[PDB]
Amino acid sequence: LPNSVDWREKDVVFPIRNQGQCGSCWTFSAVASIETLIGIKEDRMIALSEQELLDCERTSYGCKGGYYTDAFAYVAKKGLTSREKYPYIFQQGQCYQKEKVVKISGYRRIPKNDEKKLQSVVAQQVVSVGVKSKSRDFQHYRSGVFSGACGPRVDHAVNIVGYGSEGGVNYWIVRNSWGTNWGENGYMRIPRNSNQSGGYCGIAVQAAYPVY
């Protein structure tokens, strides 16, 4: 495996987005993983609709949380339209089935706590993960390899877009949907192979990724 991976430098990751208040992080995480997968497999960068998932994915809770795994299943069964055709309106609305621009074939779930298998997959694509976000340290993070306190429970869907090392401290590169004023232009470097079981802030507890 490569010592370092950063899909942002590979022309397959769109700019950081902002979910606002709506608990639609799961739609952002699912969309981010699919967008990059389509970029890797087809060399096509097409911005996809979080709003369709929020409005139309029936296992989730709209602005009160949801499942990127089931979002993958939805895209595999029904396809997904573009962000231009169906933009994000910061709240759940009427479910529209517009012209779809992409499918996937399925998804896979990574075993709990297996950062080694996680690294294997991150070296090939972007992965959807959940983190324990509900803490002052996590919300107020600005720069560096995060060393602060996590929330009590996994409650926030994000993505891993790469991995690397600074001063011999291994980290994952985490894409969030809180806009660019959070962290390092919207991203966080979180310890990799850390001493927290489930990964730092639970990042390895429930990882999943789309299959083209």
The dihedral sign for the CA sequence 29, 13, 188, 89: negative
Residue among 199, 194, 173, 195 nearest 185 (CA): 173
25 is catalytic: yes
Q: How do the domains of the chain map onto residue ranges?
A: 5-211
Strands (E) across 14-111 are located at 106-109
- Crossing angle of the two packed helices 68-78 and 25-42, in degrees rounded to 10: 50
Residue among 32, 24, 138 nearest 75 (CA): 32
End-to-end, the C-alpha distance of the chain in Å comes to 21
Buried b (16+ CB within 10 A) or exposed e, 140-162: ebeeebbeeebbeebebbbbbbb
176 is catalytic: yes
Task: Count CB neighbours of 8 within 10 A.
Answer: 18
* Cα–Cα dist 154/40, whole Å: 29
Task: Kindly name the residue from 25, 56, 150, 201 that is annotated as catalytic.
Answer: 25
CATH of domain 5-211: 3.90.70.10
Task: Kindly name the residue from 56, 156, 159, 201 that is annotated as catalytic.
Answer: 156
193 is catalytic: no
- Resolution of the deposited coordinates, in angstroms? 1.5
Q: Which experimental method was this entry solved with?
A: X-ray
Task: Kindly name the residue from 56, 150, 159, 176 that is annotated as catalytic.
Answer: 176
